[PDB]
Amino acid sequence: SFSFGGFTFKRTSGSSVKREEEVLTGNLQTLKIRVHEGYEEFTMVGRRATAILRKATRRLIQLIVSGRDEQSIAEAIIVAMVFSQEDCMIKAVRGDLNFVNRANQRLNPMHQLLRHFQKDAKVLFQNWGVEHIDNVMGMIGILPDMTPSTEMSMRGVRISKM
Ligand SMILES: CN1CN([C@@H]2O[C@H](COP(=O)(O)OP(=O)(O)OP(=O)(O)O)[C@@H](O)[C@H]2O)c2nc(N)[nH]c(=O)c21
Numbered sequence: 001s002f003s004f005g006g007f008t009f010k011r012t013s014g015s016s017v018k019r020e021e022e023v024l025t026g027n028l029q030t031l032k033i034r035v036h037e038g039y040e041e042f043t044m045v046g047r048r049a050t051a052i053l054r055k056a057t058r059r060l061i062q063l064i065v066s067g068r069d070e071q072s073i074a075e076a077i078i079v080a081m082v083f084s085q086e087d088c089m090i091k092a093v094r095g096d097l098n099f100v101n102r103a104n105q106r107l108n109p110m111h112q113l114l115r116h117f118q119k120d121a122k123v124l125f126q127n128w129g130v131e132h133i134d135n136v137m138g139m140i141g142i143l144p145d146m147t148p149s150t151e152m153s154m155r156g157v158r159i160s161k162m
Contacts, residue, residue, distance in 0.1 A: 005079030
């Protein structure tokens with residue numbers, strides 16, 4: 001297990017090979033990220049939300065989240081989207097990233113991204129994408145403005161009523 005974004009991640013299936021990649025944000029800032037290539041499934045546990053995530057190579061496949069309120073659910077979605085390393089997330093960055101930790105040391109690139117989207121996830125959610133969903137009992141969709149929907153949801157994302 002490891003911790004990211006206030007969530008305890010535990011991998012429950014799959015594996016990944018690693019490779020270094022440089023990505024370029026819209027503000028023309030180069031970020032050096034470590035990509036984990038391959039299908040993996042994780043449970044995420046937070047203070048007020050939990051999630052199950054399936055990802056592949058820079059690609060969120062499926063995310064289910066449960067939480068007490070809109071805020072904590074949003075927090076889990078943000079962490080999963082950043083963790084996915086999806087291009088649309090990199091492209092959602094606005095301005096330069098220069099965040100530091102509690103010892104004023106520069107955060108590594110995944111935490112630069114996390115901090116950025118913890119401040120504002122509007123562009124992230126807006127650029128992520130939406131899809132039609134099926135009616136499945138116990139599950140509901142969520143739109144980029146956090147409105148629930150029985151018909152549509154952000155791509156790959158479902159909210160559990162349980
Ligand atoms: C995006 N990220 C970041 N990340 C981090 O990289 C750590 C795992 O690195 P690792 O131990 O070198 O790879 P691992 O798959 O565990 O190797 P192995 O299973 O052979 O022991 C995780 O604890 C986590 O902090 C990731 N780890 C996994 N498994 N998948 C991922 O997508 C990611």
